[PDB]
Structures are given as C-alpha cells and as structure tokens.
Amino acid sequence: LVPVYIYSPEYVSMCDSLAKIPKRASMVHSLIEAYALHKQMRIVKPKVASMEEMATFHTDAYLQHLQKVSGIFDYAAAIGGATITAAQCLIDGMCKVAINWSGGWHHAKKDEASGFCYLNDAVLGILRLRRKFERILYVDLDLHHGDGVEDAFSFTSKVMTVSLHKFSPGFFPGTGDVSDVGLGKGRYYSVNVPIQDGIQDEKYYQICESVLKEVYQAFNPKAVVLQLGADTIAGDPMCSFNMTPVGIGKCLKYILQWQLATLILGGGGYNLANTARCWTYLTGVILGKTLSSEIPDHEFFTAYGPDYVLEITPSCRPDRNEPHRIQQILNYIKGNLKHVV
Ligand SMILES: N[C@H](Cc1cccc(Cl)c1)C(=O)N1CCN(C(=O)c2cc(F)ccc2F)CC1
Numbered sequence: 001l002v003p004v005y006i007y008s009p010e011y012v013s014m015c016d017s018l019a020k021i022p023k024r025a026s027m028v029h030s031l032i033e034a035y036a037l038h039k040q041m042r043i044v045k046p047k048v049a050s051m052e053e054m055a056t057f058h059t060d061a062y063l064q065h066l067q068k069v070s071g072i073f074d075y076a077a078a079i080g081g082a083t084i085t086a087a088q089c090l091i092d093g094m095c096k097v098a099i100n101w102s103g104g105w106h107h108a109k110k111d112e113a114s115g116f117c118y119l120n121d122a123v124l125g126i127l128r129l130r131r132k133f134e135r136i137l138y139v140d141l142d143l144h145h146g147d148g149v150e151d152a153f154s155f156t157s158k159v160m161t162v163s164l165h166k167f168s169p170g171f172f173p174g175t176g177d178v179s180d181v182g183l184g185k186g187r188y189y190s191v192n193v194p195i196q197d198g199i200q201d202e203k204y205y206q207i208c209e210s211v212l213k214e215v216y217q218a219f220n221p222k223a224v225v226l227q228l229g230a231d232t233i234a235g236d237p238m239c240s241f242n243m244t245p246v247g248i249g250k251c252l253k254y255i256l257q258w259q260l261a262t263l264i265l266g267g268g269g270y271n272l273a274n275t276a277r278c279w280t281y282l283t284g285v286i287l288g289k290t291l292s293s294e295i296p297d298h299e300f301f302t303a304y305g306p307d308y309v310l311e312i313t314p315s316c317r318p319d320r321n322e323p324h325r326i327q328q329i330l331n332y333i334k335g336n337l338k339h340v341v
C-alpha cells in the first residue's frame with residue numbers, strides 16, 4: 001500500500017520549538033516536500049494523545065508532574081499522539097509503513113524523564129500495535145541505547161527489543177552491554193549490540209543484517225517499530241560513528257523485505273541539514289524512489305551549503321571495531337538466541 005506520513009503544519013511548528021533541534025521538523029518536512037515525496041504518500045494528521053493513552057505506560061503522578069513542570073507536557077502529548085496515530089493506521093490496515101520523523105524519544109521511563117526524553121512515544125506506539133499484532137520487534141539504530149523501550153518491555157517475551165549503539169565509558173546512558181538480555185520470561189528477548197567509534201556503512205550493515213537475520217527466525221515478529229536516529233551520521237556533534245544514510249538505508253531496505261507492518265520513527269540528530277538529508281533519503285528508500293543528488297531549491301536551501309548535495313561524506317577517523325571483538329559479540333548473541341522460541 002501507499003505509506004502513511006504523519007504530518008500537519010501545527011505538529012511541525014510545535015516540534016520546531018524543541019530545545020536542541022530548532023526548526024528540525026520544518027527542515028525535514030520541507031526537504032521531503034521539495035523532492036515531491038509527500039505526493040507519493042498518504043498525509044495523516046496527528047491526534048494529540050489523551051491522558052489515558054499516555055497512562056498506558058506513564059504513571060498518573062509522573063504525567064501530573066509533567067503538567068506542573070510545563071510547555072513540555074503539550075510537546076509530549078503531541079509527539080506521543082503522532083506515534084499512536086501511526087500505530088492506529090497500521091492496526092486499521094490503511095498502510096504497511098507509517099512514518100513519524102518527529103518521534104523516537106527512547107530514553108523516557110514509566111515515571112522519570114531522561115536524556116531529553118519526557119515521554120516514550122515508541123513504547124506508546126508498541127502498546128497500540130499489540131491491540132492487533134501478537135509479537136512486536138523493536139529495532140533501534142540511533143547512536144544511543146534505547147534503554148527506556150528495553151526497560152518497558154524487559155519482563156515480556158511478547159516484545160523483542162534490538163539496539164545497535166555506541167557502548168563506551170562515559171557515553172550516555174552507559175547501558176546496553178551484550179550481557180543485558182532482559183529478565184524473567186523476557187530473558188533473552190532484549191538484544192544489545194555494543195559498537196565502538198568510527199564504524200562505517202559496510203561493517204554496520206554486515207553486523208545489523210547478521211543480528212536481524214538470527215532475530216527474525218527465532219522471534220518471528222508480526223509487526224516492527226524502527227527507530228532511525230541520525231546521530232550515527234558523519235558530521236554529527238555526537239562525533240562517534242562514521243555512517244552515511246546509504247548504510248542506514250540498507251538496514252531499512254533489509255527490514256522492508258519482511259513486508260510486515262512497520263512503524264518508522266526518527267530520533268537523535270544535531271547536525272540539522274544532515275538529519276534532513278538522511279530522513280529524506282530514507283523516505284526515498286521506503287518509496288523505492290531514487291533522489292537527485294542536487295538539493296532542490298526550497299525554504300532552507302541555504303542550510304545545505306557549500307555543496308548543496310544530498311550525499312554525506314565519511315570523516316577522517318579510525319574504525320575502532322576490531323574484527324575479533326565483533327565476532328565475539330555476534331557469537332554471544334547467537335548463544336542468547338538459542339533460548340528464544
Ligand atoms: N537519541 C538521544 C535522545 C533523543 C531521542 C529523540 C530525539 C532527540 Cl533530539 C534525542 C540523544 O540523541 N541524546 C540523548 C543523550 N545526550 C546527551 O547529551 C545527554 C542528555 C542527558 F539528559 C544526560 C546526559 C547526556 F549525555 C545526547 C543526545
């Protein structure tokens with residue numbers, strides 16, 4: 001079917017006022033619009049999340065605390081609502097792929113905010129999907145460990161979380177080692193792929209394809225939630241991984257072959273123009289459309305200078321991922337997946 005694109009000018013204007021990502025939502029939407037990708041998609045207005053929908057995960061006391069600390073409660077309800085709307089379109093069979101580039105706030109816990117995440121829209125989207133889909137696979141390709149999502153579903157074998165992230169001393173949130181596998185009946189239903197700085201497209205895709213192939217066979221998912229934070233992209237202030245959207249695009253294309261109901265989320269990404277270049281290219285991957293290298297003129301054309309191209313170039317830095325450590329990591333995951341049925 002035609003992909004669902006979660007959008008309204010009110011939703012974009014609200015997300016533009018977010019702290020460390022000013023005007024990022026407008027930049028992403030206007031680049032997608034400049035490439036005429038919105039014409040190939042079903043524009044769906046996001047509904048604002050009600051107190052009850054947010055309370056499917058968050059405590060009433062924390063939600064009430066969020067109201068008192070606010071305009072953060074309104075941003076939270078709007079983003080959580082946009083993710084719930086994408087899950088609803090998927091539930092209703094309106095589409096096979098539903099996109100909310102302004103979501104993916106993966107660090108937020110039941111009764112505590114963290115890492116700039118005040119509400120876990122991903123958890124809220126997974127819960128709505130569980131209304132029709134028996135098993136959900138959450139895949140997190142953001143530079144950071146999706147700890148809030150993993151923690152939310154740590155006890156259950158009904159939702160499997162897979163996170164590929166930088167895992168190094170003093171690197172936030174500090175969690176997600178290969179030995180972190182969930183608890184109780186959910187033991188071995190949490191997968192963590194610790195990665196070092198300087199990773200490039202080919203090695204990242206080989207790691208990701210290798211884990212997902214094993215995960216898909218052991219878990220047999222009925223729906224997917226995919227978090228695609230652009231903070232892994234070369235040139236990001238995070239200054240860790242050395243990826244391009246071509247590498248992430250391959251992970252995305254591999255997952256799309258499953259032909260399962262897929263909920264697409266954004267995430268981190270502080271180089272604003274590179275984030276928009278990434279998510280625009282990725283929207284082209286979903287639509288199976290190849291984009292012209294030249295950025296078309298639009299409201300934010302000047303932000304793409306001095307090359308004005310969609311392609312991203314890796315930086316001059318070493319790949320700190322030793323081939324023997326990667327195989328030790330993959331072998332340990334294969335050992336864990338022997339307990340997944
Ligand atoms: N993917 C995450 C969270 C996210 C998800 C969706 C959209 C956005 Cl815009 C951001 C991320 O990009 N972070 C959180 C952690 N970071 C921090 O500086 C940091 C923040 C803290 F509260 C404490 C210590 C820290 F070190 C770096 C930025």
Ligand SMILES: [K+]
Pocket residue numbers: 140141142143144145146163164165
């Ligand atoms: K991740």
Ligand SMILES: [K+]
Pocket residue numbers: 153154155156157158159160161182186189190
């Ligand atoms: K789990």
Ligand SMILES: [Zn+2]
Pocket residue numbers: 142143144229231267268269
């Ligand atoms: Zn991140």
